[PDB]
Amino acid sequence: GVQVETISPGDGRTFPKRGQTCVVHYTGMLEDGKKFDSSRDRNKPFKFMLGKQEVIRGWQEGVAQMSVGQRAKLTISPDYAYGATGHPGIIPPHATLVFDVELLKLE
């Protein structure tokens, strides 16, 4: 559902726990490499609570496998993203997504 491939290693020790706020920088891309969303383009980190059902499954699960300081490529199956429906106009049906995510800190 999600496959993680490290771009830059983190501390390899400090991983998110359920209920912690994960503070990340990210860029979300369709399979073709085209960016549809980025906290980097906003110049402001994005926060989410691990376990809340706001953020797509694969993005959360991928981040749970990351340590503080790590940057990684999360390849997310539609099953763990927007599924059959997608988000028409932005995310097509059955889309594989790629997120470049850096776990900045936990709060």
Catalytic residues: 26, 36-37, 56, 82, 99
- By the 8 A CB rule, do 82 and 95 touch? yes
Cα–Cα distance between 72 and 16 in angstroms, integer?
15
Cα–Cα distance between 87 and 1 in angstroms, integer?
18
DSSP label at residue 62: H
- By the 8 A CB rule, do 96 and 76 touch? yes
